[model samples]
Target: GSSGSSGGGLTEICRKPVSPGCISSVSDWLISIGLPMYAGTLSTAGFSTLSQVPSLSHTCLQEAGITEERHIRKLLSAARLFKLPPGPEAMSGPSSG
Candidate 1:
């Protein structure tokens, strides 16, 4: 698949097996982070996993009908921070505190 210029390279989310439950968890994570209406939106855009979020450009989001600047900013910020469902590494680490 072709890649875009959305910053860093994309990585797969959730190291475990790719099951519908896992994908739904990622999607639910997006919804938990102020994107209550974006679950279907992201899915329709072929982004069934949180990993794809970091690679979504503004244009891409807009094309996906996420034209609101506020939502775009929130999504971008969360993506950059990798604040989705805990990945394998994230689960094994001690609390940052």
Candidate 2:
């Protein structure tokens, strides 16, 4: 008789849970970039509770644990034009319109 060993592979994202503030800060950064902010569930981890600061900067995202450039790119990818309420045409674009 012979014995065989088997193992399962674990991916980094699956091996560890995303940090508490990970997505929140992502949302915050997106908002700071003048992107659309969707107030809904971001993923299985749940919706982001982060609010945008008027004076936000890119450094803030790094402070919030967004270390990877790809992660930052992913966040920005979700962005769409942000619509401004009618009045003086605050913005211009699909979401803005």
Candidate 3:
């Protein structure tokens, strides 16, 4: 629809499937964003990518052990940004424009 069309490569992440290193380098992105603490935790818990990070729902985040509301709040926002299509467009398009 109209809202989705503005995303640029936002559509890219969906069309392409992924695993952590398979795409976003999610480890570094998440680690640097706010909490590097869960970097390994999420990975060990089967969440090494923004695909799962941003793809997650509220309950899934807690189920994954991001129990601290602070960590949870951080992850939720960071997750949205991490997997947000802004990253794709953030990486591409805006170069020297």
Candidate 4:
């Protein structure tokens, strides 16, 4: 239970237990958010967990080929939301541009 705030009232991201019928792991959670492709890009950029998401810079995202400001903001929003236990309404995919 190392959960603490990472400013903005967001808690620290940590690994949780995996059960047979659950979407476990931050990577899985990212993919679940309709970001499988971008998730791969994040992995390529050495980000393997939700904790790293908040620290991602504009340059980092642009270097990862995510130049669209909308997408960048969405990714940041998702990272912020991930700190809390997502509700049913919070489980929607990203918006289509």
Candidates in descending TM-score order: 1, 3, 4, 2
For candidate 1, write residues 4-78 as lDDT tens digits: 368876577836644353324446567657686887887898877667876777887888899899999988777
lDDT of the structure predicted as candidate 4? 0.69
Off by over 4 Å in 1: 1-24, 83-97
Residue range 1-97, candidate 4, lDDT tens digits: 5444666753488567754653445566666666666877878888866667756677878988888898787777776666545456655568733
Model 1 residue pairs with clashes? none
- Could you say which candidate leads in TM-score? 1
Q: Could you tell me which residue pairs clash in candidate 4?
A: none
- Candidate 2 lDDT over 1-97, as tens digits, reads 2222468755466455554643345355454554433223231234343333323234544555455676545454444233323576566776754
| Model 3 weakest 10-residue run by lDDT | 1-10
lDDT of 3 at 95: 56
lDDT of each: 0.70, 0.43, 0.67, 0.69
Clashes of each: 0, 1, 0, 0
Local accuracy of candidate 3 as per-residue lDDT tens digits, 7-97: 4555335665453553345576775675778778778878855678777567876777777887788877877766355443344454553
Candidate that beats the other on TM-score, 2 or 4, i.e. the better one: 4
Question: Can you list the residue pairs that collide in candidate 2?
Answer: 83-96
Each candidate: RMSD to true structure? 12.0, 15.9, 13.6, 12.4
Error of 2 at 57 (Å): 3.9
TM-score of 2: 0.27
